[PDB]
Design brief:
The protein has six helices and eight strands, in the order αααβαβαββββββα. By secondary structure, the chain is α+β, with helices and mostly antiparallel strands. The strands form two sheets. The chain has a six-stranded antiparallel β-sheet, with helices on one face. It has a two-stranded parallel sheet with strand order 1-2. Helix 1 (about 5-15) runs antiparallel to helix 2 (about 20-35) and helix 3 packs antiparallel against helix 5 (about 80-95). About 35% of the residues are buried. This is Periplasmic protein. Keywords: Calcium, Metal-binding. GO terms for molecular function: metal ion binding.
Length: about 180
């Protein structure tokens, strides 16, 4: 299971220049700063840090791109689509110490935008109502406070779950994690 580390990040930073180098350093500093902080603060600051990046959409559909970006690709590009935001938030939260089993990247139907939309769901317990970390809403809100989002499936490095796992049955995700190796 691919890992993000402050040490790998600091070395990436020195291979780039200008603002790109600064983004890597900032990402590494974020991870360092959030270790051993309250979970709520970790969620809030990873969410807000990444929500400042460039939000991309397909010019034709207005929705996400077919290609899923690794965290490094997101940083190099200076942003990505809703799926890419959720992915880097996920890996970064795992890096600061939120247990991966409490985090599920979630593919949902947006009932308001009439298109698919990806968010990161945080589960206090697996039976608990999840908190939604979104790229089109700054607040972290409970699922029942997001009736505009209807989950279809969710996944993380370990599993894949249908709404109502072997995440590698998700081809782009399998390939994504292999790029991170």
């Amino acid at each position: 299971a691919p890992l993000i580390s402050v040490e790998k990040i600091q070395k990436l930073a020195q291979s780039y220049q200008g603002d790109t180098r600064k983004r890597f350093t900032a990402w590494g500093n974020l991870i360092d700063s959030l270790k051993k902080k309250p979970v709520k603060i970790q969620l809030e600051k990873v969410n807000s840090f990444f929500n400042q990046f460039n939000y991309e959409t397909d010019p034709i559909t207005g929705a996400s791109d077919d290609y899923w970006k690794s965290p490094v690709e997101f940083i190099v590009d200076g942003g990505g689509d809703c799926e890419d935001f959720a992915i880097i938030k996920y890996f970064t939260l795992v890096a600061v110490g939120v247990p991966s089993d409490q985090l599920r990247i979630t593919y949902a139907a947006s009932l308001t935008l009439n298109q698919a939309h990806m968010v990161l769901s945080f589960y206090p317990t697996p039976e608990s109502e999840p908190l939604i970390l979104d790229s089109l809403e700054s607040k972290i809100l409970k699922a029942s406070a997001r009736p505009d989002l209807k989950p279809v499936y969710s996944f993380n490095a370990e599993g894949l779950w249908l709404a109502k796992g072997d995440s590698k049955s998700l081809g782009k995700w399998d390939a994504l994690m292999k790029r991170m190796e």
